[PDB]
Design a protein around this ligand. Structure first.
Ligand SMILES: COc1ccc2c(O[C@@H]3C[C@H]4C(=O)N[C@]5(C(=O)NS(=O)(=O)C6(C)CC6)C[C@H]5CC/C=C/C/C=C/[C@H](NC(=O)c5ccn(C)n5)C(=O)N4C3)cc(OC(C)C)nc2c1C
Ligand code: NA
Lengths: 13, 182
């Protein structure tokens, strides 16, 4: 019932 | 040469839980691909043309934690397993692939970039088979052209005996079809 949470990211080159 | 990637963790376990409950995330967002989590699962979102897209089987109907509070999905298509939220500020938005190259790359949650050969609208073969365990938690990750444009997002793995030889994805044409009907 909670929100989805951004826990990290991926940076593309 | 070729496309490379790396990951940065932005949140711990306890911060994740709390942000899940308040739906408030004040963190700077950056990157083309977001690493996402719910109570039970982790997966990826790909930001394409101002929408952060991911799989329904990861996100269900859920809001995304955001700076002004929870963000409602602007696109929910259950049968194609696709959802999207308007992209939070700072997410680097990618470009849909036009040219039509059949030589692809899948970006995983470990930020590996692996070669895929496109076999059809929604499918591609892994040039090197990988264990299923290695692909888990990567649904929502982008399939890219060599130029770095997005051809689709990872949906499901085709596998036998814990080994995946191929991947099923949602083509970027399905996304604009959703942006059409919705
Ligand atoms: C052909 O279209 C498909 C294909 C698969 C779907 C689906 O698959 C469900 C969900 C999906 C799945 O697990 N995707 C993956 C994944 O990582 N999910 S995940 O991130 O861990 C997660 C969990 C948190 C979301 C990429 C796979 C990694 C390794 C996982 C390895 C073991 C599972 C094999 C299975 N493969 C297939 O079912 C398959 C492959 C080819 N065809 C025809 N079917 C499969 O990949 N999935 C079953 C769920 C779903 O849910 C909706 C009905 C809401 N819709 C799907 C649709 C529409
Ligand atoms: Na890498």
């Amino acid at each position: 019932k909670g929100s989805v949470v951004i826990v990290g990211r991926i940076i593309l080159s | 040469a070729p496309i490379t990637a790396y990951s940065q963790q932005t949140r711990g376990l306890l911060g994740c839980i709390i942000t899940s409950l308040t739906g408030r995330d004040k963190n700077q967002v950056d990157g083309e691909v977001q690493v996402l989590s719910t109570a039970t699962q982790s997966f990826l979102a790909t930001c394409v043309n101002g929408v952060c897209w991911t799989v329904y089987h990861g996100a269900g109907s859920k809001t995304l934690a955001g700076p002004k509070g929870p963000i409602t999905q602007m696109y929910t298509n259950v049968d194609q397993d696709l959802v999207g939220w308007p992209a939070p500020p700072g997410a680097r938005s990618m470009t849909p692939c036009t040219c039509g190259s059949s030589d692809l790359y899948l970006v995983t949650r470990h930020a590996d970039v692996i070669p895929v050969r496109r076999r059809g609208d929604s499918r591609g073969s892994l040039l090197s088979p990988r264990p299923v365990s290695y692909l888990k938690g990567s649904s929502g990750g982008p399939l890219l052209c060599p130029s770095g444009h997005v051809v689709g997002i990872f949906r499901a793995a085709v596998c036998t005996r814990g080994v995946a030889k191929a991947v099923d994805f949602i083509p970027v044409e399905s996304m604009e079809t959703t942006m059409r009907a919705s």
